[PDB]
From a paper:
However, the structure of a P450 bound to tioconazole has not been reported previously. In the case of voriconazole, it was clear the 2 R,3R-stereoisomer was bound, while for tioconazole the R-tioconazole was identified as the bound stereoisomer. The voriconazole, clotrimazole and tioconazole structures contain multiple monomers in the asymmetric unit, and in each case the general protein conformation corresponds to the “open”, substrate-free conformation of the enzyme, with little significant difference in protein or ligand conformation between monomers. The binding mode of tioconazole to the DM heme domain is similar to those of clotrimazole and voriconazole, though the latter interacts with the heme prosthetic group through a novel ligation via a pyrimidine nitrogen from its 5-fluoropyrimidine ring.
Among the bacterial P450s, one of the best characterized enzymes is the Bacillus megaterium CYP102A1 (P450 BM3), which Armand Fulco’s group identified as a fatty acid hydroxylase that could catalyze the hydroxylation of saturated fatty acid substrates, primarily at the ω-1, ω-2, and ω-3 positions. More recent work in our group has used the double mutant (DM) form of the flavocytochrome P450 BM3 enzyme (F87V/A82F), in which the first mutation expands available substrate binding space in the active site, while the second mutation is more distant from the heme but causes a structural readjustment in the P450 that alters its conformational state. We also report the first structures of the BM3 DM heme domain in complex with four different azole drugs, confirming the greater plasticity of this variant and its ability to structurally adapt to bind to several azole drug compounds.
Residue numbers in the entry: 3 to 189, 194 to 457
Amino acid sequence: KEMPQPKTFGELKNLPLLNTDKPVQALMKIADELGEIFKFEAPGRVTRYLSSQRLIKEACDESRFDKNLSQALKFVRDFFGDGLVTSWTHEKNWKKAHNILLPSFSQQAMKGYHAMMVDIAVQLVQKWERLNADEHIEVPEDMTRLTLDTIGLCGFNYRFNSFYRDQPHPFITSMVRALDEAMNKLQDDPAYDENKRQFQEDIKVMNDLVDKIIADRKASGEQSDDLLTHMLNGKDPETGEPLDDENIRYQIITFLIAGHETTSGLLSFALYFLVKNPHVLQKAAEEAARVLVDPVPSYKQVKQLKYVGMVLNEALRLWPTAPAFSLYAKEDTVLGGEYPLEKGDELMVLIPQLHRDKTIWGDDVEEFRPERFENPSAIPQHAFKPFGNGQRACIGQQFALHEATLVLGMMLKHFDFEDHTNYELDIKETLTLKPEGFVVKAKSKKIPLGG
Ligand code: HEM
Ligand SMILES: Clc1ccc([C@H](Cn2ccnc2)OCc2ccsc2Cl)c(Cl)c1
């Protein structure tokens, strides 16, 4: 009945516990100590972190709890506006944008996206084919090159050309530097006149890209029917109106970021686990060689990479790259027959801890075993939630998994991988998670590509 709560620092409640670069991992340690639920207090705010499937399945009941804009989400709303990720479920532009953009992520749009995904995937493979002996691969860096280019090309017919650059595309660098400048600005001096600029030019770099993506499309003798097409011309089935110009800008920035960061972390973590578990890599590589018999993979061939998809879900089990989502109680209710909640109370689903629930997965929760996912009907409801919940679940789930399956399959078909530094897992936390510094050597199997 009584709610566990970690340690207090007087007025600053529990916050100094998150005075760290890895707050999610710190919150996971707190969950290990206190268990399935614990209150976390901050000046003027209370959050309850859930970690067990028993409680989280109640939280995922949309008749009792709806998606909450956490403080983090309310903060980044300055950048993402009332786009799909940062709007309330009862905000009119959420339902309207959901209705308009849902057809862009169907298992029919994916068929039309496939060739452009292959385009960027081939560029990745060719980069690694062209490395000299004893040169190595910066894995999350190259996965980000891939996922950024893929969402840019598939969604907006815009080429970031990340494999033509030595460092991240200026749009990425400007946003990363703009987000932290907004973080530090919360804490009017002469020496900040340089900061308020790096800011202004960063805002301009991103407004210029959004302007160009829209202008390129309007000037195009267009054979285009992609995500941007529906943003600009899709009519709402309810109201019959398209999205307004301001919301469209927010959706473009929303999908550019959401469309690549979490998928890059997934591919990075999957390759990390494969090189740390050579028996699983050998098994996945055998499926890639068996299934991908053509110079470029086809849509149907990717859908037959069954074990690769299991490798991906097991990487999402251990390190779901969007590791938490927030809910609020629609009315007074009792959670799990033990914990009374008031209307408006916030719940935070700690996905990595949920995915380590021994009562669901057994004692070996830390082992990388993709065979856990051989029979999806053996996985209880709400035990596996890497893509959120309900009507506010990830609209891009199928996009991410198709891209990641295609790419990982092509990686396994064309290269043997060596953990040449004996890499020690270091998880950097930004908007997503990724294994920082993860490097490998890839020896080419010398299998031709197509074109
Ligand atoms: C492995 C990769 C990904 C993971 C783990 C992931 C995870 C999630 C999660 C947990 C949520 C719910 C957030 C919340 O409740 O506050 C969400 C929502 C969302 N995601 Fe993803 N995502 C991934 C890839 C993508 C991709 C590729 C796209 C776009 C192409 C995308 C776009 C979105 C959008 C627009 C929403 C908001 C949906 C709505 O509320 O209407 N995500 N995602
Ligand atoms: Cl605290 C927090 C941090 C990051 C995210 C999302 C996760 N994610 C990515 C793709 N699907 C879900 O990434 C940041 C982001 C990207 C566009 S808008 C927006 Cl916020 C959320 Cl939801 C909440």
